[PDB]
Scaffold this active site. Structure first.
Site, PDB file in Angstrom:
ATOM      1  CB  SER A   1      -5.712  -5.670   0.569  1.00 26.95           C
ATOM      2  OG  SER A   1      -6.900  -5.168   0.851  1.00 26.95           O
ATOM      3  NE  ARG A   2      -7.103   3.058  -1.936  1.00 29.07           N
ATOM      4  CZ  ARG A   2      -7.383   3.857  -0.701  1.00 29.07           C
ATOM      5  NH1 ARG A   2      -7.051   3.165   0.487  1.00 29.07           N
ATOM      6  NH2 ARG A   2      -7.933   5.023  -0.719  1.00 29.07           N
ATOM      7  CB  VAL A   3     -10.318  -2.875   1.373  1.00 26.31           C
ATOM      8  CG1 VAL A   3     -11.188  -2.962   2.684  1.00 26.31           C
ATOM      9  CG2 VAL A   3     -11.210  -2.736   0.381  1.00 26.31           C
TER      10      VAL A   3
END
Ligand SMILES: Nc1ncnc2c1ncn2[C@@H]1O[C@H](COP(=O)(O)OP(=O)(O)OP(=O)(O)O)[C@@H](O)[C@H]1O
Lengths: 220, 116, 147, 116, 145, 59, 276, 115
Positions: free
Chosen positions: E9-11
């Site tokens: 997940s980039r967040v």
């Protein structure tokens, strides 16, 4: 005993496309009168090439390997004529002149593949149309087995119904021995360490595989 | 390539050469992965006879002397059949594989083996 | 929160994130997305489920599982099944996206599932090849990334 | 469908689904449509879905289908079996080794799958 | 069936609540040590202590992430399972009784410490009071149940 | 010899000193010594731990 | 890239896979042959050990130097190793247990001395610098006890002059066909009626202890050969499985290239036909 | 990457790193089928130095601090040339390979090896 029909390489593509149908009509003469005939089409692949040339020059829309959409219909129209007809069809055709006899036309089409690729378009079509295939391999041909029949992947759907009683009785152990030799063929250079029954199956498979060789122009 | 055209002897020499080379074509990657010692004895003899067959198939040419530097050879049919039959029968199992490369007749392979 | 331990512990999803669910057939992609929809029934996030190219009995089983777990009243379902026109299969994700953008533009929070974007690209490929547009990789149109 | 609408449970047997797909390829090639990936018709999934979505369980009765599948070039990721396997609920695999043991019917219990 | 090697997940933890972000730092590394060592369980009795204990923790974290369809867990229940994995309360528990252990622990915290789970389910807060109450409830579960 | 059991425990070769001392001298001579190491090296474990971890990637 | 070179790599790994499947069965047959050579040497050694344990109690008036112990800082090791490869951790776990038992004496300040059987242990102490007092290699798939006499006599003569105080042998024991256990086993420190002695019984004890040490070293060598063939069986089964894994990956790459080639040829035919 | 721009030392270190990684790339199928044990001794040493080179080429980033929590590193060019030269010469053959992973300098690999 043989009619020879020729459409050579310098003739028109229309004549090369029509030659198998013309030869099939000549063979059907004997099937419709309660007699039996056998036809060989020595290259159906070149007939498909000539029909592809005719269809592309008439600006008909192309498909896979630039063949038209009716190339399966071209080979299916031809190969469904080879058949065994009942005594009722023969009595209907000859108006009662020939009675109590079936008629037949047996086909042996021949397909040339490119480096063993049987999944190209025209070989996939003729494999799907026919009742069975005899595969010949180049590697078995180079190894000295001069009829190069791969018995593992060749198949006849009619089977033992198309055999006499003595051949159908004797052929099953030869099939079992060839399948055992195909499973045990890697062990032949290390057969001195094997079990006794495994060695006996390997030697019987080697003897059956050596018996399957046969010269040209000597039919038994 | 028919026994009624070239004779029986020529046909058995050519099919013996093709059988030994087709066998070695199936043994090449096995020697490339595990090595030479991991085979049986007849495989070792057949691989050595096959490498000598593959070097003896070569020939210096008269029109290729600008490319090799060595003079060209003319080899007769009977010299070719006798030389390939002598390699197939194990009559040259003692010579090294480099003796059969770019020589001509089988006598020239014997003369080259004394210079290695 | 999807309600799964591995997803909420390792790969967390936030409000406004795009998170792809990718893998082979019949290994639980609809299951993870439908359980992420069912976990929004008391959280304030409204839901849109878009089915593209699926079977009708699969869609009716999904809406029955949404009603049996008490989350159908929070969810709009948009359906374009496998025997519809390819135009409706191409256009159904944008229609469901407009339905979620109603709640986006008024200061509320929504969540949308596109349960096959791969079948939408197949339907857009069908429409583009019938218009005789020249294709590229895997016979897809040149604007397929833009799709 | 008429047998289903008399209130019955009907079986429908399709001898090859790949020949239905190939007949769609041939008919689309005769009309001059631009072909899709690996030679197929561009309406491949739609022509599969028009046939397969009519085979369902309804409120009057059901039709259950048994369809034999050919796989081209032993490739499961070819587009014709990949479009066909999206509609199938079960697979039955027939085996030569179970039939050589005398066990009939020759269904492989490890290779046959079901979504049920 | 989540492949933890390539899922990302980039967040990340900017979206996560505090207790979930604090307790999930050791999950991915336990699954990472399990990737290659999962094929070593057929000979793992003749291995050193750190490799054996890393493989035992990897089997426990792998058995913890299994979950049924249509069974959602709240913030407090995943925090209980993640604290039971992360703080070493799975160490004397065999693999075939991990997840049944998890279910029994959840039921015990639903009938004894329900105000603690209602405190965690507000906004996912974490402090020393919540830490001490969870560890006292897990030690009383491991001693009396 | 036991009064119910006879046990002859034989020899594969003749045991005399002229045959056995030559084998002892050939065993002393064939000890290949390339470097006169002290024996207290660390490099055994530095090769052995790497080669022990490399063997389980195959199985 | 193109499908031809992928097809040739599939044919190469298949031709490797057939013969690794064959040499697994060759390792099974040589393991069973080494098991029947393992089973034949035991009723010599149990009768020698029963005669030794009777004669040591019936005559306490002589003690041989083998039967008693000395606490002086030097020990000896007999390492049994193979000469070929394709053994998955037979030699390596044996060498690991060897340095594990050697480090307890090396930290004490004691000296060590080594007898090496096999080419791989000779390569090990040739690369790392062990001090070898006796070495032998090139024993075949049936070893004979007349080959071992010299290295065992060098080991015993180094005991008899007071240089060695304790002897061990490091070899692999056959637990089952799946398990090879590297051990270290001590050699030199080992009904009320009496045997008549035709010679002096002291020289009888002097002979029979030497023959017992030779039978124990020969049983360790033959059991290590059976463990070598079992490890070769496990390694060729693993090589066949990893070859099949690489064949499956290359077959997926080939099917991708076949589909891309058909799509590219059809795009060229359609783009050529649209321009005419 | 030309000796008249960067000097002979940096160029020789880069060519030696690329030689060791190319000869490691040529042994992948034989390592996958038969293992590391049937290589020769210089090949085994080159595979060991190649895995230490492959681990030492990684680096924690300042913008990747959100992904891992490990702090980012800035490494000068001189420390990179000296560290890869020390791996290629054999100065760190006693270090394990996982001490070369995700560090800045070669000195941080020296401190990570004692843990
Ligand atoms: N957590 C789970 N535990 C047990 N079974 C599960 C779980 N998740 C999914 N399944 C089962 O896995 C099967 C496949 O799941 P699902 O239908 O969601 O897969 P999919 O990849 O979305 O498939 P489709 O190709 O139909 O889109 C179903 O029968 C479902 O019951």
């Amino acid at each position: 005993n043989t009619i020879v029909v020729a459409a050579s390489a310098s003739e028109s593509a229309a004549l090369q496309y029509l030659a198998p149908y013309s030869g099939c009509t000549m063979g059907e003469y004997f099937r419709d009168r309660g007699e039996d005939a056998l036809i060989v089409y020595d290259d159906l692949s070149k007939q498909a090439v000539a029909y592809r040339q005719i269809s592309l020059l008439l600006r008909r829309p192309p498909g896979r390997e630039a063949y038209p959409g009716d190339v399966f219909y071209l080979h299916s129209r031809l190969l469904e004529r080879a058949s065994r007809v009942s005594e009722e069809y023969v009595e209907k055709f000859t108006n009662g002149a020939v009675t109590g006899k079936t008629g037949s036309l047996t086909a042996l089409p021949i397909i040339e593949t490119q480096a063993g690729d049987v999944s190209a378009f025209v070989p996939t079509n003729v494999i799907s149309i026919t009742d069975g295939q005899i595969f010949l391999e180049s590697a078995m041909f180079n190894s000295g087995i001069r009829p190069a029949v791969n018995a593992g992947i060749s198949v006849s759907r009619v089977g033992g119904a198309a055999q006499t009683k003595i051949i159908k009785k004797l052929s099953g152990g030869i099939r079992t021995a060839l399948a055992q030799y195909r499973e045990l063929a890697a062990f032949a250079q290390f057969a001195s360490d094997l079990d006794e029954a495994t060695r006996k199956q390997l030697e019987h498979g080697q003897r059956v595989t050596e018996l399957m060789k046969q010269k040209q122009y000597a039919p038994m | 390539l028919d026994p009624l055209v070239i004779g029986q002897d020529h046909y058995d020499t050519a099919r013996g050469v093709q059988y030994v080379l087709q066998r070695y074509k199936e043994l090449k990657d096995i020697i490339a992965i595990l090595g030479m010692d991991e085979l049986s004895e007849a495989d070792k003899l057949l691989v050595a006879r096959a490498r000598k067959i593959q070097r003896f198939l070569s020939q210096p040419f008269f029109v290729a002397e600008v490319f090799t530097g060595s003079p060209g050879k003319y080899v007769s049919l009977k010299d070719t059949i006798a030389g390939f039959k002598g390699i197939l029968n194990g009559d040259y199992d003692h010579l090294p594989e480099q003796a059969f490369y770019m020589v001509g007749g089988i006598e020239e392979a014997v003369e080259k083996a004394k210079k290695l | 929160q999807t309600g799964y331990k591995s997803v909420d512990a390792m790969i967390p999803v936030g409000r406004g994130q795009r998170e792809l669910i990718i893998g082979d057939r019949q290994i639980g992609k609809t299951a993870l997305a439908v359980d992420a929809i069912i976990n929004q029934k008391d959280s304030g996030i409204k839901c849109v489920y878009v089915a593209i190219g699926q079977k009708q009995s699969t869609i009716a089983n999904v809406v029955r599982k949404l009603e049996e777990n008490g989350a159908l009243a929070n969810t709009i379902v948009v359906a374009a099944s496998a025997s519809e026109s390819a135009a409706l299969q191409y256009l159904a994700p944008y229609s469901g996206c407009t339905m979620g953008e109603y709640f986006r533009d008024r200061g509320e929070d929504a969540l949308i599932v596109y349960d096959d974007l791969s079948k939408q690209a197949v339907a857009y490929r069908q429409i583009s090849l019938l218009l005789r547009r020249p294709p590229g990789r895997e016979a897809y149109p040149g604007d397929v990334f833009y799709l | 469908e008429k047998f289903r609408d008399e209130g019955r449970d009907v079986l429908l047997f399709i001898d090859n689904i790949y020949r239905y797909t190939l007949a769609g390829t041939e008919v689309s090639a005769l009309l001059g449509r631009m072909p899709s990936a690996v030679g197929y018709q561009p309406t491949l999934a739609e022509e599969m879905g028009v046939l397969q979505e009519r085979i369902t369980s309804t409120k009057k009765g059901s039709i259950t289908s048994i369809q034999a599948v050919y796989v081209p070039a032993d490739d499961l990721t070819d587009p014709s079996p990949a479009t066909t396997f999206a509609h199938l609920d079960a697979t039955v695999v027939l085996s030569r080794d179970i039939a050589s043991l005398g066990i009939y019917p020759a269904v492989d219990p490890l290779d046959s799958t079901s979504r049920q | 069936a989540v492949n933890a090697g390539i899922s990302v997940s980039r967040v990340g933890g900017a979206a996560q609540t505090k207790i979930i972000k604090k307790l999930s730092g050791g999950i991915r590394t336990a699954l990472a040590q399990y990737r290659e060592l999962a094929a070593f369980a057929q000979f793992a009795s003749d291995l050193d202590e750190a490799t054996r204990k890393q493989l035992e923790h990897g089997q426990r974290v792998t058995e913890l992430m299994k979950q049924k369809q249509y069974a959602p867990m709240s913030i407090a229940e995943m925090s209980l399972s993640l604290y039971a994995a992360e703080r070493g309360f799975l160490q004397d528990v065999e693999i075939a009784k991990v997840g049944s252990f998890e279910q029994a622990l959840i039921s015990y915290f639903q009938r004894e410490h329900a105000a603690l789970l209602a405190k965690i389910n507000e906004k996912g807060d974490f402090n020393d009071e919540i830490d001490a109450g969870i560890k006292a409830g897990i030690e009383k579960f491991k001693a009396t149940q | 010899v036991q009064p119910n059991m006879v046990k002859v425990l034989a020899d594969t070769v003749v045991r005399a000193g002229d045959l056995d001392e030559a084998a002892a001298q050939e065993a002393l001579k064939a000890a290949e010594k390339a470097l006169q190491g002290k024996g207290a090296e660390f490099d055994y474990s530095a090769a052995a731990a790497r080669l022990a971890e490399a063997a389980a990637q195959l199985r | 890239a193109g499908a031809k070179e992928i097809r040739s790599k599939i044919a190469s790994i298949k031709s490797t896979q057939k013969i690794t499947n064959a040499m697994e069965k060759v390792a099974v047959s040589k393991m069973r042959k080494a098991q029947m050579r393992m089973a034949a040497g035991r009723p010599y050694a149990e009768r020698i050990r029963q005669v030794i344990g009777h004669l040591a109690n019936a005559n306490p008036e002589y003690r041989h130097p083998f039967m008693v112990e000395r606490e002086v800082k030097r020990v000896g090791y007999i390492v049994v190793s193979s000469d070929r490869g394709l053994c998955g951790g037979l030699n390596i776990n044996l060498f690991k247990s060897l340095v594990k038992d050697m480090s307890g004496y090396r930290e004490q300040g004691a000296e060590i001395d080594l007898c090496v059987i096999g080419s791989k242990g000779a390569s090990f102490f040739r690369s790392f610098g062990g001090n070898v007092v006796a070495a032998i290699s090139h024993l075949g798939e049936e070893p004979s006890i007349n080959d071992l006499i010299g290295s065992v006599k060098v080991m015993l003569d180094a005991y008899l002059e007071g240089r060695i105080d304790r002897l061990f042998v490091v070899s692999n024991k056959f637990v089952n066909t799946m398990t090879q256990k590297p051990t270290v086993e001590q050699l030199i420190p080992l009904h009320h009626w009496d045997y008549l002695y035709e010679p002096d019984a002291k020289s009888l004890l002097d002979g029979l202890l030497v023959r017992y040490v030779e039978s124990q070293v020969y049983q360790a060598v033959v059991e290590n050969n059976a463990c070598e063939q079992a490890a070769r069986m496990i390694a060729m089964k693993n090589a066949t499985d990893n070859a099949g894994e690489l064949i499956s990956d290359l077959q997926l790459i080939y099917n991708k290239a076949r589909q891309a080639a058909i799509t590219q040829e059809i795009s060229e035919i359609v783009g050529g036909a649209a321009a005419v």
